[PDB]
Structures are given as structure tokens and as C-alpha cells.
Amino acid sequence: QPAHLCFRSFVEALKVDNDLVEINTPIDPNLEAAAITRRVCETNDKAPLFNNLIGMKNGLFRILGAPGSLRKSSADRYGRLARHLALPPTASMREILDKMLSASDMPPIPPTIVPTGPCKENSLDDSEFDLTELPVPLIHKSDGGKYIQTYGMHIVQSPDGTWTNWSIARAMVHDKNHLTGLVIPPQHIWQIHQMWKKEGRSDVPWALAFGVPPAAIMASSMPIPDGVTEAGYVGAMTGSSLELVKCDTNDLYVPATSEIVLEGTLSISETGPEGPFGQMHGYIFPGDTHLGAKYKVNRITYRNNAIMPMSSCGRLTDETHTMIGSLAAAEIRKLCQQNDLPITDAFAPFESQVTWVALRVDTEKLRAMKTTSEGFRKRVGDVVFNHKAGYTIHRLVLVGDDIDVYEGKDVLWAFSTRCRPGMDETLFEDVRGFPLIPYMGHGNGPAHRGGKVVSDALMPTEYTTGRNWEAADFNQSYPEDLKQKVLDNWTKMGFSHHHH
Amino acid sequence: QPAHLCFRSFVEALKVDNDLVEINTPIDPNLEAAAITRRVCETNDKAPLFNNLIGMKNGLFRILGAPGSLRKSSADRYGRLARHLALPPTASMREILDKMLSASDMPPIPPTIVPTGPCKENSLDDSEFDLTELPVPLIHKSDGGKYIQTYGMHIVQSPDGTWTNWSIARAMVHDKNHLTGLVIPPQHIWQIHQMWKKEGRSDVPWALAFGVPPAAIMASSMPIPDGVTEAGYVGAMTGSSLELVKCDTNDLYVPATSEIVLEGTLSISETGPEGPFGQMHGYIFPGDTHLGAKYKVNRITYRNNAIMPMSSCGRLTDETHTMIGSLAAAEIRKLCQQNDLPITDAFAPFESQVTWVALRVDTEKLRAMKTTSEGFRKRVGDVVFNHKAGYTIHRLVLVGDDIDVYEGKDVLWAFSTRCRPGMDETLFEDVRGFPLIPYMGHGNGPAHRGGKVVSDALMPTEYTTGRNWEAADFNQSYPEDLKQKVLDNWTKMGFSHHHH
Ligand SMILES: Cc1cc2c3c(c1C)C(C)(C)C[C@@H](CCc1c(F)c(F)c(F)c(F)c1F)[n+]3c1c(=O)[nH]c(=O)[nH]c1[n+]2C[C@H](O)[C@H](O)[C@H](O)COP(=O)(O)O
Ligand SMILES: Cc1cc2c3c(c1C)C(C)(C)C[C@@H](CCc1c(F)c(F)c(F)c(F)c1F)[n+]3c1c(=O)[nH]c(=O)[nH]c1[n+]2C[C@H](O)[C@H](O)[C@H](O)COP(=O)(O)O
Ligand SMILES: [K+]
Ligand SMILES: [K+]
Ligand SMILES: [K+]
Ligand SMILES: [K+]
Ligand SMILES: [Mn+2]
Ligand SMILES: [Mn+2]
């Protein structure tokens, strides 16, 4: 099966790419696996595959860390992500986000039901597993539990059957047959949970599939629209119908090649202690435990030699930056265009801990609007900060066409030099806030509301007659023929490869 | 003579350090010298010495570019700066700024007058030079003139004789015997000019010395206090009295080893076209010419084989970042401490185009103050933004003790995650603004007033009981013995030098 359609094949692809380190000696799931993975993420090293995990029994489980993190080289920086999508490993961010948006104006391709698959090779009922005995990692030393779920896909369906959502949300082991996890507004798992709670008749049928098709985990991490079944979006993106098997204990359908599947229910009534979890902004607040959603596990099914993917998340750079930030930015780009705003590109700078999104403006279109900074900032912020796709983002930075928003250095240059603090900004206090950011939930104001800003780094003439500067840089402050001469004589004169 | 006391010896030191490229074939001062230098600055390469400058006659002049820019390696990143000060080339930023502040609580060491020096080896009177015939560089293609003065020291004295100021301010050739340049409030050259204008009797006696002692050009770039003669500050810093010769045509005194000296007057009445100049923020606004100060040159004296230093300034990284930003930050650190504020360190992040300063707070002292963010931000901003040392800085970022302000990545992490936009900030509209920043002079509001902010990236418990998080990073989320194990097995397992 192709890498983008089968996690096992994706692991092969990483090896083949010389982008894997297989570690065949014993590694402790208590912190050691995650510490190695953290080091990988902070240095852009090869992804670690832990084949000998202390406490692995009955095939459960090996671990792959850093599945969506960065490679060291510029040329294939995003290659792990490209490998989730059948793209060349040299794909740019623009090309990856375009691929992730491509299904938004295609008919869905619904999934195909098949009678069995590798995820049925082994099973454990209600009397044979114990989640506390599996080699579930402790990812950060102050975490409030062992976070089994950092890169699997939750599957829940609306009561009426019309929407099946796939998404990533964290969960940790509570006891032998339960997890606790985050289920928070406006996320689709929470929206579906609310529908079941209002019906009031039963717990939510649920499955959690680990090691799913890579193209599926990418859509799981993207805020595609309300009511859109991710499986059909992924089908359209990839040009093929995904193959799903039925769960044994419920009528949900999981990818046929899933490494590990949990089947059970998400309670509409019960909660249990959850967190703290070291995460995306780079913090853990020891002891900050709160009641979370509670999941009951009734059955485990799994591949022979199952592999659990893991995100050792925190400070730069991991899946929480490369996938959450970038995919939100992609959706924001589209949302802006659908609202008739002249946005060409969007990216969440890593330097902002993916709390900002830079929006590149087609300033010829802006000029034709005949507007002003105050008005345009208000319009952009009203569209983005009132939509789910903007939930995690607290600062929008508007920049003109000379800025490559995929280059954080250029975003920072524009922000620092073109946006006058206060005057060129509009604060938004009456919008949903993201409580996970430390200055929100652990800050001075309401955890759930406000704290957002649009920062206009467009210069005044960009609204009127056009850019009226040139950069004081080698590119823009010297004629072409001189630049080329300098370059051609560089090593000759005595000064100091694209792949590397 | 030592490198820090003699520019010629400093050039030697750079060679010796393998930090110079001598270019002995013809180079055009019209853009080519500056384009090579710009490329050096954008890549942290070796400093260029142009020994064969098209239009060099009668010994005037060779050019050294990038005298204060960065080296490529981390270990000696600031070595060029360290070479201005007799510090080891591995000196940290903290050590360089401490050296620059050290004379602030020492008695001055006044300069020593000597009868002659190398700067007297050659001379040209009022009938023998023509500034338009010298090989003065065109530094950026859209500059409004040929900027002879980017790294020399202006020397002016108060009418009463009690204060002699040394400072860098740009100047360009106006005609055969005049320059025009920036002379703007609150700069000391402007403050002294105002004193002469109020006396009303004569133009200001002036000299401009190029290729001065490196320790002197560093003080020239620092906002030491009003009324303090830089020569005595530099004497105290270096532990030696600087040797000065008298000018031939006035009673000012110049460093004995100056490469090139212009003698003349700064008019109290006349002005001429000046600018635009590609500069520190990274921009040139073509055609943005305005009346500047006008200097008359009566005499040139110069060393045999004179060398003119040049800053090809603009986008990162050059003297306008490494010296202007860092030295302002140093002075701000001291100012805060003298106002009883618990600041331990200050630095202007390069990523902000040196428009921000990050202030590291001793949070044990903060806790004892028993204050709040609003109050503390107001206090800090009132001290800094009402003082000349704060003139160029538009955003102050307050951070706690875990942050290394000399590391821009850590400043950006703290700013993005600990400061809630709006709520955790105080805007200052009734302070002097720096008009050179594009969002000021080319922005939406008053060029000279406001646009400043204090951004509090202290978390709430840092005011009360102490830090209540740990970073989700390899350093803080794993015990010591595990970290060390991981490190010791890193290459063993299959993953990938301090000087490199
Ligand atoms: C890639 C990834 C995504 C994570 C995610 C993780 C990863 C690795 C970790 C498990 C390592 C960390 C956490 C990050 C948490 C977090 C977010 F990052 C986030 F963006 C949210 F909007 C959010 F509500 C949130 F809680 N995790 C969650 C989560 O727990 N709950 C959440 O609610 N979301 C989480 N997301 C983000 C979601 O997958 C996306 O927002 C996605 O758009 C949700 O799908 P849908 O609701 O169908 O649009
Ligand atoms: C290192 C350096 C310093 C430059 C400076 C340059 C360099 C390379 C360039 C010539 C390349 C560019 C320009 C930068 C300009 C500029 C500034 F950078 C600045 F910080 C100022 F406060 C300012 F008013 C200003 F205009 N230059 C000037 C200047 O023209 N006028 C100016 O008025 N100052 C300029 N400074 C900065 C000053 O040297 C310092 O602010 C110093 O503190 C002034 O001395 P004093 O007035 O005695 O405190
Ligand atoms: K999703
Ligand atoms: K602006
Ligand atoms: K000075
Ligand atoms: K704060
Ligand atoms: Mn969804
Ligand atoms: Mn001074």
C-alpha cells in the first residue's frame, strides 16, 4: 500500500528516506522514549522508532516519535509532511497547504467498506487487556498521566448518522479500561458530544485509531468545516476511496490498516481527572488537573507488531507547530478568500509558537477596495476571530506582497518595522479565546474570551498608490548586473550547497 | 599600538584573526564596495578591505567594510566587537556591554595632548581637495548622495568648553567643500548645536575623524549621559588616557592615529538637501530628501595609505544592529537600575530590527515590591521612554529570570506566550518617538510622538509567589540523569563542534 494510505508503509518510507533511526535495545516508556523524541524535535533529527519498549507484551506496542516534525535540511525541511500526502519530499509549505485545501472544492469520495484488514490481526476483549499494563509513555516529567493518545484519530458520529468526524485530541490512561481527555468547544468532538448529551439516551459510540493512513491524520488535524466527514475529504484529496473496516463492538468504521484500535464509548455523564499536559506553547503547569471527558474502552484490536505514533510536544518544533498551526493557517486563507478578502497566503510563524498567523495581501486588489487600515483590520478580524478556524490564533499580522509569510524572519521584519503599536492595531475582546495559551488560562484576564489583535503591517501607500520603498538589502538595493558580478566573483575574491 | 587604541592595528588584528578579506583588484565605490559589504553582513562573512578603490588618489582612500558586524561561528560571534575593546574574541554580549558600562562609575581619565601623530602625515588645504573627486561610496542604489560618513566620529564642543562630544551621525557629500547630514533631537550633536545657535555668534567648530581608536567609536555609538565627555569615558574604560592632537585650523583635538580627519564648521544657519539613507530598519524611501545640517570642510589631514571604515547598513546584521541597539540596551539596563527597578539585563533583539528591548527582571526583587503588572509597566515605561537612552526603542518586553534576553528565540517565545495582547500592555502616546522607523515617519500617525508600548511577558505568579511552570523542553521536562544518558547514547543509538 502507498505511504500516504498506510502507516506501516509510511514508516518504511521514512527508513528508505534515511529519515528514521531504529532503536532495537530496551527503551523505557517512562520518560526515556519521549526525551529522545523531544531532543529529535529540538534538533530536527531523524524520527525515532522504538522497537524494544520496556513493558511491550502480546505485540502492544512499538513507538514512532516525531512523525510530523522537521528535517534538518532546507531542501526537504517538510519532507515528513510531504510523505503524509504523496508529495515529493522537497515540497514547499505552500504546496502542502494547497494539497490539504484541494478537496474543499471537490465532491467527497466516500469510504469503501471492506470485510477485514490488518487492524484485525489481533484482539483483546474486556477481560484480557489492562491499559495500565501497556507501555504507555510518560511524555513530560510533570504530566498528570500517561498520554497514550497524542497522534491517533478519534472517530465519533452525529446521532443522525450524517456526519462522521475524525480529529486528534489528547487522552491519558485513567484506569484499566478508561481514558480521560480534552473535549472542548468549539472542537468537532465537543460539538458531536453535545448532540448526544442533548438527546440524553446513551453514551457516544467511539473509536480511537492509532497509526492511521497518514493522509487521514493530516485531515484529523485540520479544521475543515462543520458537518464535513473527514473520510470523504481525504478521499477527494487523495483521489481514492479510503478502505474502512467495521468495529467489532459498535457500528463505527476504522481504517483497515490502523495499527491499534480502541473501541468503546465517550460518556455523556462521567468525567475524571485529566492533565496537566506539556504542550504546544511550550509549558506544563504541574498540578493543573481538571475534570475531563471520560472514555470507556471495551475492545482493542491491533496489527501484528503494532506501532503507536507519539508526539513529544512542547517547545519548537513538533507536530503541534507543523500541523496544527499550518493547517489552521491554510483554512484561514480559504476562509478569508471566501469572504472576499484579498489574501493570497497564510502561515502561522513558528517563532510565535503558532499563536500568530501572517496574512499576505494582494495589494493591487486592496488598492481597488479604496479602504483604510482601521476598516480593513476590523473586517479581517471579524471574519477570522468569529470562526472556528481562528480559534487558536491570537494575533493576525497583515503584510503586503513583498513578504513571504512562510519565512518567519520576513514576517518579523515586517511586523517590527511596519506596524505602529496601538495605532495600527485593533484589539478584539469579545471573541472566543484559546485558554491553552499561558497568558489566557494562566493569565490576568478571562481564560475563554478576548486577548486577540489584528496588527496591520501594511504601509500607508499600500492602500493608495503602491509600495514607496525599496529594501536596504542585497536583493533590492543593487542592480541585477552588479549582484550577479558580486556572486560570480565571491569565492574568487576570498569569501565563503542547496541540498546540504 | 594595541588594536583597541589604533584603527590601523585593529585592521591587523582582523587579518591575524582570519576575519579579513583583502581585495587588491579594482573595486568601484559606486555601489560595488557596498554591495560586497552588504553581502558580508547578510551572511556573517569576513570583513572586506578594499585596497584598490577606483578613484583613490593621493592616498585617499582604501575602505574597510563591516567593521562591527558578526562572525559566522557561535563561539566568536561578537569577536569584531570584542576586538574594539581588548576583550577575548569569545566574549559574550553580556561581557561586551559590561565593559561599555564599566566607566559609568569610574572617574574619567582625561585625554593627553601630543604634538603630532599619524593623522598628520598628509594634508590638503582649501585649494587642494574636492570632496566630489574622492572615491566616496554610493552605498544603496537609491541613496540621495554619496555617504562619506557612516563610521567616523563627529567632534563638537559646548560653547563654554566644558563638554566635548564624540558621536556617529550620517553625512553625505554636498559639494567640493561641504557635507550635509542628520542632526536631530535629542542627540548630543543636536544639543550642542542648539547651544551655539542660541549664542548666535558663530558656526560650530567641528571635526570628523574616520578610523579612530576602536574603543572610541564604540563610545561614539553609545548614549552615555548628557554633559559627559566621551574621551574621558573611553579613558576610564580602557584604563589609559587617549592621545589626541590639535586640529590645524581649530582648537579641537582628534585621536592621534585617526586615519582621516576633516576640519571645519557645522553651520548654525545653513542647510542643504540630505538623504534618503538606506538604514538600520532595512528601508530606503527613494526621493525622500529633506533639509539637513550643513558642514563646511576647510582642511583634510590623513595617514599614509588611509583607510575609511564604512557601514553598508540595512537588513540584518550590521553595525546599526550590533552597536546601536546593543549599546542603547546597555544604557537602558543601567538607567533602570539607577531608578531602583529590578532589571538584571537588557538587549535589543535583532529579530525586532533593534526596535524592541527585552528587560530581564529579578523576580525575587519584584515579589518583594508587592506590585502589579499595570503599575510596574507604567513605572518602567515612564523611566525609559522619557530618557534619551530609550529614544530609538518602541517596545519594551519584560521577562522573568528564566529568559536569556541575549537569545532572540527565547525572547520571542516569552513574548508570544506570556504577554496577552492589550491587557498585558501599556501604550505610550505622549513620549518622543523615533521618526526613522517606517511606521513612524512614513506611517499613519505623528512622526515624532508616541507609538511606544511596554509589553509585560511576566506571568502572574512572578509578582506573587514564584514561577509555577516548567518548560516542555528537553532541559526542563526530564531529570538530569536521564538527560545525561540520552546525550551520552545519542551517537550510539544513530542520531547526529562548539568552535565550528
Ligand atoms: C496534531 C495535534 C493536534 C491536536 C493535538 C495534538 C496534536 C499532535 C496533541 C495531542 C499532541 C496536543 C493537543 C493540542 C490541543 C489543542 C489544540 F492544539 C488546538 F488547536 C485546539 F483547537 C484545541 F482545542 C486544543 F485543545 N491536541 C489536541 C487536543 O488535545 N485537543 C484538541 O481539541 N485538539 C487538539 N489538536 C488539534 C486538533 O486536532 C485540530 O484543532 C483539529 O482541527 C480538530 O478537528 P475538528 O474538530 O474535526 O476540526
Ligand atoms: C553605529 C552607528 C550609529 C549611528 C548611525 C550609524 C551607525 C553605523 C549610521 C551612520 C550607519 C546610520 C545612522 C543611524 C541613525 C540614527 C540612529 F541609529 C539612532 F540611534 C538615533 F538615535 C538617531 F537619531 C539616528 F538618526 N547613524 C546615526 C545618524 O545618522 N544620526 C544619529 O543621530 N545617530 C546615528 N547613530 C547612532 C548614534 O551614534 C548613537 O545614538 C549615539 O548614542 C549618539 O551619541 P550621543 O549623542 O553622544 O549620545
Ligand atoms: K479534523
Ligand atoms: K501599518
Ligand atoms: K556617544
Ligand atoms: K503577562
Ligand atoms: Mn471535523
Ligand atoms: Mn554624548
Please indicate whether residue B231, judged by its CB atom, sits closer than 6 Å to ligand 2: no
Nearest to B262 by CA among B214, B210, B188, B308: B210
Same domain, B471 and B357: no
Q: Which of A474, A484, A486, A490 to mutate to test the interface with B (most CBs of B within 10 A)?
A: A474
B242: β partners: none
Q: How was this entry determined?
A: X-ray
Nearest to A149 by CA among A253, A245, A273, A275: A275
> What backbone phi and psi angles, to 5 degrees, belong to B281?
-65, -20
Distance CA A284, CA B468 (A): 9
Same domain, B221 and B75: yes
Same domain, B359 and B317: no
Counting other chains too, the contacts that A80-83 makes at CB distance below 8 Å and 24 or more residues apart are A80/A14, A80/A19, A80/A47, A81/A218, A81/A322, A81/A323, A83/A3, A83/A4, A83/A10, A83/A13, A83/A14, A83/A17, A83/A214
Q: B309, B330, B351: which is the final residue of a domain? A: B330
Please indicate whether residue B323, judged by its CB atom, sits closer than 6 Å to ligand 2: yes
**Residue A170 to residues A167, A216, A358, B235: CA-CA distances in angstroms?**
10, 17, 27, 62
- Residue labelled with grid coordinates 516534525: A69
**Residue A246 to residues A399, B409, B437: CA-CA distances in angstroms?**
48, 47, 62
C-alpha cell at B106: 569610574
3-state secondary structure of A435: coil
Distance CA B274, CA B225 (A): 28
Calculate how close chain B gets to A431, using CA atoms only, in Å. 13
Cα A327 to ligand 4 centroid, rounded to whole Å: 27
B255: β partners: B244
Same domain, A169 and A186: yes
With CA atoms as reference, the chain A residue closest to B468 would be: A285
C-alpha cell at A100: 490539504
How wide is the angle at C-alpha A441 spanned by C-alphas A438 and A442, nearest 5°? 60
Same domain, A260 and A245: yes
* Amino acid type, B104: S
Cα radius of gyration (chain A): 24
- Nearest CB among B21, B373, B413 relative to A353 is that of B413
Distance CA B296, CA B267 (A): 8
Nearest to A212 by CA among A148, A147, A167: A167
Distance CA A226, CA A208 (A): 20
Same domain, A325 and A351: no
Residue spans of beta strands (DSSP E) within B314-377: 343-347, 356-361
HSE at residue A134, side-chain half, CA atoms within 13 A, is 29
Distance CA B207, CA A110 (A): 81
Same domain, A88 and A179: yes
Per DSSP, the residues of A106-148 read S-----EE-S--GGGSEEE-TTT--GGGS---B-STT-SS---
Distance CA B207, CA B164 (A): 11
Distance CA A424, CA A332 (A): 21
Please indicate whether residue A373, judged by its CB atom, sits closer than 6 Å to ligand 1: no
A345: β partners: A360
Ligand 1, closest atom to CA A191?
Answer: 47
Distance CA A414, CA B316 (A): 13
Cis amide bond preceding B317, omega within 30: yes
- Residue labelled with grid coordinates 570584542: B82
Question: Of all residues in chain A, what percent are helix, strand and coil, respectively (each to 5)?
Answer: 30, 25, 45
3-state secondary structure of B64: strand
Element (H, E) at B337: helix B326-338
Kind of pairing between the strands at A153-157 and A164-167: antiparallel
How many other C-beta atoms lie within 10 A of the C-beta of residue A448? 14
Same domain, A290 and A366: no
Ligand 2, closest atom to CA B222?
Answer: 43
Ligand 2, closest atom to CA B187?
Answer: 47
Same domain, B395 and B465: no
Same domain, A96 and A225: yes
Please indicate whether residue A188, judged by its CB atom, sits closer than 6 Å to ligand 1: yes
Element (H, E) at B174: strand B171-175
How many distinct structural domains can be found in chain B? 3
Ligand positioned closest to the Cα atom of A229: 7
Nearest to A169 by CA among A275, A246, A64: A275
Distance CA A172, CA A178 (A): 9
A274: β partners: A290
- Residues 6+ positions from A145 with CB-CB distance below 8 Å: A172, A173, A174, A180, A273, A274, A275
**Residue B155 to residues A474, A495, B101: CA-CA distances in angstroms?**
32, 35, 21
* Strand arrangement, sheet containing B243-246: B112-113, B243-246, B253-255
Nearest to A297 by CA among A211, A210, A198: A210
- Residue labelled with grid coordinates 567648530: B205
Instruction: List residues, by chain if needed, whose CB lies under 5 Å from ion ligand 6.
Output: B 419, 424, 456
Q: Cβ contacts (< 8 Å) between A39 and chain B: which residues?
A: 474, 486, 490, 495
Kind of pairing between the strands at B171-175 and A112-113: unpaired
Query: Which domain, by its residues, includes B485?
Result: 460-500
CB B426 within 8 A of CB B330: no
Q: For atom 21 of ligand 2, which residue has the closest CA?
A: B392
CB B426 within 8 A of CB B433: no
* Amino acid type, A116: T
Q: B301, B330, B359: which is the final residue of a domain? A: B330
Kind of pairing between the strands at B243-246 and B253-255: antiparallel
- Could B315 and A471 be called an inter-chain contact, meaning their C-beta atoms sit closer than 8 Å? yes
- Could B283 and A495 be called an inter-chain contact, meaning their C-beta atoms sit closer than 8 Å? no
* Strand arrangement, sheet containing A20-23: A20-23, A47-50, A62-65, A307-310
* Amino acid type, B413: W
Distance CA B203, CA B156 (A): 11
Nearest to A60 by CA among A307, A237, A236, A290: A307
3-state secondary structure of B471: strand
Distance CA A42, CA A66 (A): 10
CB A395 within 8 A of CB A428: no
A299: β partners: A263
CB A89 within 8 A of CB A8: no
Element (H, E) at A49: strand A47-50
- Residue labelled with grid coordinates 493591487: A364
| B305 DSSP 8-state letter | T
Kind of pairing between the strands at B356-361 and B395-399: parallel
CB B259 within 8 A of CB B122: no
Same domain, A306 and A336: no
- Residue labelled with grid coordinates 481564560: A447
Cα radius of gyration (chain B): 24
3-state secondary structure of A296: strand
Q: B280, B315, B330: which is the final residue of a domain? A: B330
Cα B137 to ligand 2 centroid, rounded to whole Å: 19
Please indicate whether residue A137, judged by its CB atom, sits closer than 6 Å to ligand 1: no
C-alpha cell at A3: 505511504
- Residues 6+ positions from A14 with CB-CB distance below 8 Å: A20, A46, A47, A80, A83
Element (H, E) at B273: strand B260-274
C-alpha cell at B419: 504577554
3-state secondary structure of B421: coil
Same domain, A168 and A139: yes
C-alpha cell at B242: 587617549
Please indicate whether residue B210, judged by its CB atom, sits closer than 6 Å to ligand 2: no
3-state per-residue secondary structure call for A46-106: CEEEECCECCCECCECEEEECCCCCCCCCCCCCHHHHCCCCCCCCCCHHHHHHHHHHHHHC
Calculate how close chain A gets to B246, using CA atoms only, in Å. 38
